[PDB]
Structure formats: C-alpha cells, structure tokens
Amino acid sequence: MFEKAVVFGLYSITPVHAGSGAELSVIALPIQRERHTGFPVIWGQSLKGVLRSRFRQLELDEKIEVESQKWKWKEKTKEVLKEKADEFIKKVEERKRDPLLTEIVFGPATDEHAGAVSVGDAKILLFPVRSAKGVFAFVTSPIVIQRLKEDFELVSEIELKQILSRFKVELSNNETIAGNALILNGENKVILEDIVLKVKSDSNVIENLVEVLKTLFGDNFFGKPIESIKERIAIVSDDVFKSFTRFSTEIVARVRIDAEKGTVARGGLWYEEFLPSDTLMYSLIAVGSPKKENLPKEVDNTQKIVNVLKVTFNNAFLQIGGDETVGKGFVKVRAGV
Template sequence: MNPEQSTTALLFIHALSPLHAGTGQGIGAIDLPIAREKATGIPYLPGSSLKGILRDRAQGKGWDKDTLFAVFGPETEAASEHAGAVQVGDAKLLLLPVRSLYGVFALVTSPYLLERFRREAEMAGLTPPPLPPSLGQGQILVAPNSRLPEGGKVYLEDLDLEARSTPGVGEWEDWLTRTQAPVAGRLAVVHDDVMAFLLETATEVVARIRLDDATKTVAQGALWYEESLPAESVLYSMVRAEPSRRKEKALPAEAGLALFKGLLQGALQLGGKATVGRGLCRVSVGG
C-alpha cells in the first residue's frame, strides 16, 4: 500500500459520564479496574471499543454490506479475506479531571502527555501550541486567567502546589476548545511524577452491589469495586484510512474516512456498564 494514498485524522473523546474501559477481573483491591498501558500505567480506551460501536451504528443506518465491509472489514468468520480501510488506534488520555478547592475541578495534564499528544496531532496535520516550560514537582502551570489558584497555590485533592502563570497554558486552553470540554480557566500542567500519582488516586472507584430479589438485601458475595475515568475526561485517538481492499467496493481513502466521520454525530456509548449510564461520550474530529 502506497503511504501517499492514506489519510489520517485525530478524534477527541470527551466523557460525559464516567468511562469504564475494563480489563476483566482485577487482582488488587479493585475488582474491575480500567485498562492501563503496561509501561506507563496511563489509562486508555481500546480502539476496538470505538470501532465496534461505530460499526454497529453504520449497520443501524442501513449501510450496504459492501460499504460496511470495505470500511470496517468483513465479519469475524471471513476476516482473512481483507482488512478494513479504516484503522482506529487506542484512545489515549490527554486531560484528567481532578477535584480542586477553587474552580470546582481542574483538567490536569503533564509534559509527557502533551508531548506525545503533540506528536500524534502533527501526524494528523494539526499544529498544537509549543510545549509549556519545565516545572518542579511542587509546581503547577496555569493560564493567566485561571480560576484555580488562590494565594499563589492550587489545591488538587490533598495536594497543594505552587501556581505559576504562563501564557503558554492559555494558548493550550484556546487550542483545546475544539474538544468541547470545559477547559477555559481550568487547564493545569503538573510534573510527570505528580501526574502518575493522580492517575492512581484520582480515578473514580465505586462500590457496586446486587440485591437478593426476595430479601432486598445484598446477595451473598455480590459486592464489588469498579474503577472508571471520571466524567469530563478527554482522550484522543488516531484514525488512519487507506483505499478499500474489497473488490466489490472501490473506495478512496478520503471517501472511507468521510463515511467514518459521518458516524460521529450525537453521543456514543463507549466501554462497559452501559445499563447504569457509564461511557456516554461526545466524539469530535480534531482540526
């Protein structure tokens, strides 16, 4: 496949309710943890979750079989025939909402998260602002108009960090308005080590129970703990399209990607626990 025939786009995923992209049974205190990258421990949403939901939506919209198979690939039993034209990458975390003493909550990121986001955004033809200046573990970078600082400090959960105002964070706030998340006055950049701590302690963990139908009390052994990314989290996913490999449906890369983008209208339910309102997301195209 000629690389010049392919086209890419960046998708932003804004969680409107807690997002549970699970990994099955946990081995620690949390019975149902979220998926995390092995090397970094950063939460992510598998690309298969997004692709599967959009494939179902395409079927619901009445796509003909050849178009559906050209864009998403054939059914599992015929998967060896050809690949789909659209490749959906895992959705990586960009902004984590963290409770703040002032401004209600902050949308927190770190130099590493911004660096790898910038790398993929440039691959998709976007031009994000420059990376903000370096900072120490006890510092936090905010925009000049931030609603988070009070008395030179920003208080996140049980952390108090020295606030440093920089126009660079304001540029990122302006640029990230395209995610449709409430970033204005709330964006904060912390040290990578502090971010690692927040990724372990600032996710949402809730106790779930199942009631016995007869007694309306907790059924024996039916208590478990479940982890989710909080509502207002922002993730991003790289999408790449190539010309169709299906003989019955010639489709240029741009046309396949356009069909894929057309499925993003309205809210999507991603991850698990849909019946209890988890995973309601707004997906938009960057740029």
C-alpha cells in the same frame, strides 16, 4: 498502507468503565491502563468494536448520507455486485454478515480483504480533579503534551506545526501551570484534591494547548464555550499526574440484594472502578485506500472514505464499556476537521 489519518476526540458525559486489567491490585475490575505509564486508556480493539457497531446500525436505517446524498445499502450491493448480491442481501439480513459499505470501511464480518481504516488507542488528554477554587480542574502532564505533539503532526502537517515544537516545559513535583480560575487569590498557589501546588508563571504553554484543541475540535468544545475551558487547565508533574489517575478515579462499591430477606447476599459484594466524566480522550484513526473489489463510485480513494467516517461520527453519542444499562459509557465525539 494507511495513506492519511484523522484525529478523533472523546468526552465522557457519564463515567466510563471499559475493559479490565491483568493487574487487579485492589479493585476487582480496574480500567484499561497503559503498562509503562499507567495512564487510563481505551484500547483500539475495543474502541473499534463500538465504532463499527454504531456504523453498522446506521446502515440498517440508511443514515450514512455521502456527499450530502443519502445512502441506500440495499440497492448499492446489487449495483456493484449483482449475481449473488441478492443472496448477500439475505445473508446480511440473516445476521450472518454485515452491510456492504461498512465492510469496506470497518472490515469484513466473522465470515477476503481488510478494513480501510485502523482504530488507534484512545490516549488521555485531560483529567478532572476536584479543586478548591474552580471546582474541578483539567490536569495534564508535560509528556502528555509530548504524546499529543507527535501524533497531531500526522494530520495538520503549517502554523500549528511551528507552535507544536514550542511545547517543551519542565515541571518539578510541586510546581504547576494553571488557569486563572484555579489559582487562589492573593496566595499564588493551587490546591487539587488535598495536594498543594505552586503556580509557575507562564504565558504560552496553556495557551498553546488550547490553541491546538480549537484547531482540531472546532470553536465549540463538546457543548461548552472554549473560553470557559482555558481557565481550568492545571498542568502538573508526571509523578503527580500519574498518581492522580491511579487514585482520583471513582471506585464504586456494588452489591446485589435478595428480596427474600431484604438484606445482601453472602459474597455478592465487589468494587468496580470508573473513569471520571469530563475526561477528554483522543484516538488517532488511521485510514487507507480500501481493497479494490468493485466498490461504489463514492468510496474509491482515501479522501472520500475518511469524509464519510468523519461526518457520520462528529457530534455522535455512543456507549463504551459494559455498564450501558446503568447510564455508563455515553461519550460525545468530535472528529478533527
């Protein structure tokens, strides 16, 4: 199964609060965090639930143009199913089912077969921390590069394969490797939100990381110049990076006000935690050949079923988490071409 795979990228335009956690240490609703590492994460189960719904609503509006040809789902099901396809049309319009093409891609609805694709967990790749010079910095960890090193080998692999093995850096708890826009002038040191870091001299690690990003997310970087990003990577130690993700996220106090008195209601006060904006996530999308059920001629093999997913989702803007109405969740996606 899952003959090939494609790489997705995410970039929080607005702070994201997706899911919760079984820890519940201080904040009432923390964000989904990995167990062994403690990094913030977007589970593939919840990430699929917004990927599929966005794909579904496109079918009702017929904007899934395949091979530069618009898709018309009403006739396609009749063309490939017939007989009860008219009843299939009624069931889909009854909200008891889902459009045909999506169920080949994202699996059947609650009411057979399986989806041709699998949605992996969205592992963090860049985290924003307030700095002294270079107002905010994109911080990573050496093992985060290691995680990206193995996963990226599934799609790209050959020049990037050779440079992928070059990602091997050991960092102490205070040294760092940072871009020019973050290093304090004269005093070769970097300050990242109350923590003083010493810059370690290097000329490959930061360049290599931004090299694979361009080759996997295009020359443009989510609406910003790529060169303006290369000066703001600050690779820190694992303990420093782990500590940042636990404490540098936005904890937002919230309360409900009753108009009868104008004050707050008793017990209606809690704190919720949000992933910061400008957080470059990435999730591996595994795609396989769909189950043969008289599918249309455009979705036979895996290479055709991945192009539709990549094209329809590149430069998209979907909402994750449970705070859509208050402007939380919008993320720009860049599929890896």
